[PDB]
């Protein structure tokens, strides 16, 4: 964090969303036989 | 008989941890409220974890002389190192640390 | 004496293991070894070089996945040692290789050196109390419960048919070709290139395997379907792209029935079955045609059994009841058979002791190979 | 001999330096050498012929500014030497150039000569005990906690994209264009000339920078504000004059997204990142799209995050989740990462000793480049 540290330097941008994000959203058979008569 | 090191923890953390223990609830960062933002508290924590690293280095950089000494000392040596590091990792993996 | 036998089913593509007596193999993972390709720069990176199992599967992008076994023959023994050693790690078994006799599945007609060096690996680096190398078809029939019948398997690197009569696996009727699952995936990769989509990275060949496992089928009529334009279903990559396959989904597993597409004088699966049955005693042909068991992961394609029936009917003599069974554990057939075999009291007399191996040597293994 | 290594962020726009372990860089003065323009007549005037940092920022009008480093490549070595001497001077660090290890960052893909001459300066003019040259991407990951990500920094001179996954950097996927903050300021100057306000002196060039940092934003769409011909927001100058701008506080920063405006075929910053991700492995796309790190001062424009998201969203395949981590320390991320890395002990193994360089030379630096 270090909030006063950010008060020291001049480039730290406050009141900007820190994270930009995209929206979110909510084997075979057996006995195959064949007789023949 | 390789020494053991009991890694200290910040007592306030243990206070809130025991408070999380009196009720059925897992301890988490959100429980400290506006205490995480304290640079004094975090500076204390940084110092404590730095001391932890010092203590663990005191055990991990350890080694003996394979040339001299009795062989039994070496066998017992490696076993004692496994015991030390095993207890160390269990102290590390605790939810408080 | 030891604790319990560990049935380690090998496979050129997927190794499968667990203790004997278990119901299903609890530990199954691909038989590959992945080591990173990129450069370790940032500290705190993925420590360790060689990765096997779920961790190698997870961080698949970094690895340069290779196979140590191909066509049921080990090409690199170091990677196999690390794989077996991984089987005995804390992630899979959490045991020691000193208190467990080992049942080991192995494909037929393989070189003697496989059994010899594999035995050296176990009894020397692992120092197992007892090793027992066996076939795979015998185990699959033991897993189904019946006893006489052929076994048609097609794993990842081999495929063969073994006519088993009450346990005595007839050694003079084991046809064996080397066209299996991995090779079908390889030919599928070639067809994907011909489609336009290129996949050539070693960690992308696995994506080709995934496509083979969930987007291919077997056409009943092999040519009538080729003369038509299919619906060309899509496919979602792990990357998120889209691949329309088209005709490259039914001709890809067509290789198993015609290895002319790969350019080889071998035979199809149907010819392996018919030749395995016909190169046997004429008094057992009807019994073998009435009992066919499939196993191995390559027998999981859609329309596989039905096409196999059609092909065999075209090759079997007229009015002979053909019967192909297909249990639900074709991936676990050899392992379940190993669990049944090694859990018996006769297994004590069926293995090879460590003492015996130290006395005679590899000749003791070839002596008691069955 | 070593005590608290000196981290130096050798950036072409502003040099950030301090000791290791410091959570914040204590000295961040701009990277230029200020020489006077007007003769000294009156005795007792300002002393010296070289003004650096705080003095060359208050008496800016009296000076002529010469940037030493341009596009991450040093032009006048004399000037860089003087700036480094200023760093070790009394007003900045009061240390000697022989008692502390030095971590000096560098942009990726710089020529070998920069590494060679940089170490020659730090090993000949300065008798530094230990020197380590790094990447300006890994350090941002360190100072942001992550270990897997795409570092998209845009310093004042060179922007690039480095995809790092689990601590492993994929060097062939590094994309790098030499179009950043300098070009934006210079192009803003040309827009002011088209709006009737000229600036030609070097001392007034920083007033153009001041305009950029205090009044430039990025529209979410390139044409929804283009033909609108919006209002002319005024902006005061350091004397008390007045500048109204209008179509230049958004037209000047679109040079990063399309450098065709400057007359140079290349790729925009969004294409830099998207091509750096797409050049990586097939399995690693989703993790790189969900782990995008920003750094560099040019990534502080208003609406920069929204534009970067929408451009990547247009170029990425559908429904892929795109997360862009944008910390508040985009200017000091690389430095804080340097303070972290130099505070470790693996750094001791990673640097180069003086005798190492004496016995080897440039070869030792190219060996430990990664
Ligand atoms: N659903 C599926 N369809 C087609 N092929 C599959 C499917 N699932 C797995 N396979 C293939 O089958 C192989 C599994 O056989 P395997 O268990 O390796 O036999 P073995 O273990 O005797 O080598 C895998 O290589 C895979 O390529
Ligand atoms: N608040 C701001 N908004 C927009 N741009 C800025 C801001 N502050 C600084 N810049 C621009 O970014 C540059 C910062 O330099 P930096 O990105 O640190 O370059 P380097 O990384 O090479 O040191 C400045 O020269 C200026 O061009």
UniProtKB/Swiss-Prot annotation, chain A:
Residues covered by region (Disordered): 1-25
Residues found modified as Phosphotyrosine: 6
Compartments where found: Cytoplasm, Cytoskeleton; Cytoplasm, Cytoskeleton, Microtubule organizing center, Centrosome; Membrane
Modified-residue entries (N-acetylalanine), positions: 2
Signal peptide: none
Biological role: Part of the dynactin complex that activates the molecular motor dynein for ultra-processive transport along microtubules. In the dynactin soulder domain, binds the ACTR1A filament and acts as a molecular ruler to determine the length. Modulates cytoplasmic dynein binding to an organelle, and plays a role in prometaphase chromosome alignment and spindle organization during mitosis. Involved in anchoring microtubules to centrosomes. May play a role in synapse formation during brain development.
Family: Belongs to the dynactin subunit 2 family.
Subunit record text: Subunit of dynactin, a multiprotein complex part of a tripartite complex with dynein and a adapter, such as BICDL1, BICD2 or HOOK3. The dynactin complex is built around ACTR1A/ACTB filament and consists of an actin-related filament composed of a shoulder domain, a pointed end and a barbed end. Its length is defined by its flexible shoulder domain. The soulder is composed of 2 DCTN1 subunits, 4 DCTN2 and 2 DCTN3. The 4 DCNT2 (via N-terminus) bind the ACTR1A filament and act as molecular rulers to determine the length.
Protein name: Dynactin subunit 2
Species assigned in the record: Sus scrofa (Pig)
Gene: DCTN2
Full protein stretch here: 1 to 50 of 405
Swiss-Prot record, chain B:
Subcellular location(s) of the protein: Cytoplasm, Cytoskeleton
Family: Belongs to the dynein heavy chain family.
Function: Cytoplasmic dynein 1 acts as a motor for the intracellular retrograde motility of vesicles and organelles along microtubules. Dynein has ATPase activity; the force-producing power stroke is thought to occur on release of ADP. Plays a role in mitotic spindle assembly and metaphase plate congression.
Domain-related comment: Dynein heavy chains probably consist of an N-terminal stem (which binds cargo and interacts with other dynein components), and the head or motor domain. The motor contains six tandemly-linked AAA domains in the head, which form a ring. A stalk-like structure (formed by two of the coiled coil domains) protrudes between AAA 4 and AAA 5 and terminates in a microtubule-binding site. A seventh domain may also contribute to this ring; it is not clear whether the N-terminus or the C-terminus forms this extra domain.
Binding partners and assembly: Homodimer. The cytoplasmic dynein 1 complex consists of two catalytic heavy chains (HCs) and a number of non-catalytic subunits presented by intermediate chains (ICs), light intermediate chains (LICs) and light chains (LCs); the composition seems to vary in respect to the IC, LIC and LC composition. The heavy chain homodimer serves as a scaffold for the probable homodimeric assembly of the respective non-catalytic subunits. The ICs and LICs bind directly to the HC dimer and dynein LCs assemble on the IC dimer. Interacts with DYNC1LI1; DYNC1LI1 and DYNC1LI2 bind mutually exclusive to DYNC1H1.
Protein name, as recorded: Cytoplasmic dynein 1 heavy chain 1
Protein's gene: DYNC1H1
Swiss-Prot record, chains C, D:
InterPro entries given in the database record: Actin, Actin/actin-like_CS, ATPase_NBD
Record carries keyword ATP-binding: yes
Main location, first listed in the record: cytoplasm
Keyword GTP-binding found: no
GO terms for MF: ATP binding
Domain of life: Eukaryota
Subcellular location as annotated: Cytoplasm, Cytoskeleton; Cytoplasm, Cytoskeleton, Microtubule organizing center, Centrosome; Cytoplasm, Cell cortex
UniProt keyword terms in alphabetical order: Acetylation, ATP-binding, Cytoplasm, Cytoskeleton, Nucleotide-binding
Pfam family, one: Actin
One GO term describing the cellular component: cell cortex
Gene3D superfamilies: 3.30.420.40, Actin, Chain A, domain 4
Family annotation (SUPFAM superfamilies): Actin-like ATPase domain (SSF53067)
Annotated function: Part of the ACTR1A/ACTB filament around which the dynactin complex is built. The dynactin multiprotein complex activates the molecular motor dynein for ultra-processive transport along microtubules.
Family in the record: Belongs to the actin family. ARP1 subfamily.
Subunit structure as annotated in this protein's UniProt entry: Part of the ACTR1A/ACTB filament around which the dynactin complex is built. The filament contains 8 copies of ACTR1A and 1 ACTB. Interacts with dynein and adapters such as BICD2. Interacts with BCCIP (isoform 2/alpha).
Name the record gives this protein: Alpha-centractin
Organism taxonomic ancestry: Eukaryota, Metazoa, Chordata, Craniata, Vertebrata
